[model samples]
Target: MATKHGKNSWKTLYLKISFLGCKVVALLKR
Candidate 1:
């Protein structure tokens, strides 16, 4: 259960970081 939760949490964080990265790149491009 802990491992599953950890994986889910990591994935969520990874997605959030990816989203933030996309926005940062867009701003830099602009």
Candidate 2:
């Protein structure tokens, strides 16, 4: 069984948003 931590979840979300923002910017440039 795996237990999830709140701080780690926030970090994951931050990274995901950062990556998504980069992708959107790249698409806008194209």
Candidate 3:
């Protein structure tokens, strides 16, 4: 359970970072 929870949290963090990166890239493109 602990291992799975940690993996899930990592994925969530990665997704959040990816989303924020997209927004930052979009703004920079302009």
Candidate 4:
């Protein structure tokens, strides 16, 4: 159960990081 929570949190964190990176690149073009 604890490992599952950790994995979920890690996935969520990675997703947010990925989204932020994409957004920064997109705005950098403008």
Candidate 5:
């Protein structure tokens, strides 16, 4: 049960990191 929650949390964190990556790309484009 705990492992399942941890995996889900990591997935969310990865998504946020990906979102931050997009912001960085936009800045570099400028």
Candidate 6:
């Protein structure tokens, strides 16, 4: 449980950063 929860938070934060990066890239390019 502890290991899974730790990785889950990392995954959540990484995906969140990827999501925001994609948005800014598209917005700036367009």
Per-residue accuracy of model 6 over 1-30 as CA lDDT, tens digit each:
467567579889899988988898799775
Question: lDDT of candidate 5?
Answer: 0.81
lDDT of 2 by residue, 1-30 (tens): 355566588778889988888999799864
- lDDT against the true structure, each candidate: 0.82, 0.80, 0.82, 0.80, 0.81, 0.82
* TM-score of model number 6: 0.53
Q: Identify the runs in model 4 with alpha carbons over 4 angstroms from their true place.
A: 1-6, 28-30
Candidate 4 local lDDT, 1-28, one digit each (tens): 4675765798798899888988897998
User: Candidate 4 clashing pairs?
Assistant: none
Tell me how far the alpha carbon of residue 1 in candidate 1 is from the true structure, in angstroms, after superposition: 12
* Model 1 agreement with the true structure over 1-30: per-residue lDDT tens digits: 457576579879899988898999799874
Residue 9, candidate 1: alpha-carbon lDDT: 90
lDDT of 3 by residue, 1-30 (tens): 467576579879899988998999899874
> Tens digits of per-residue lDDT for model 5 on 1-30?
467567579879899988888999799864
Q: Model 3, which residues run further than 4 Å from truth?
A: 1-5
| Span of ten consecutive residues with least summed lDDT in model 3 | 1-10
Candidate 6's displacement at residue 27, Å, is: 3.6
Model 4, TM vs. native: 0.52
**For model 4, what is the alpha-carbon lDDT of residue 29?**
65
Which stretches in model 6 have alpha-carbon errors above 4 Å? 1-5, 28-30
Sort the candidates on TM-score, descending order. Answer: 3, 1, 2, 5, 6, 4
Error of 2 at 26 (Å): 0.9
TM-score of 5: 0.54
Please give the TM-score that candidate 2 achieves against the real structure: 0.56
Off by over 4 Å in 1: 1-5
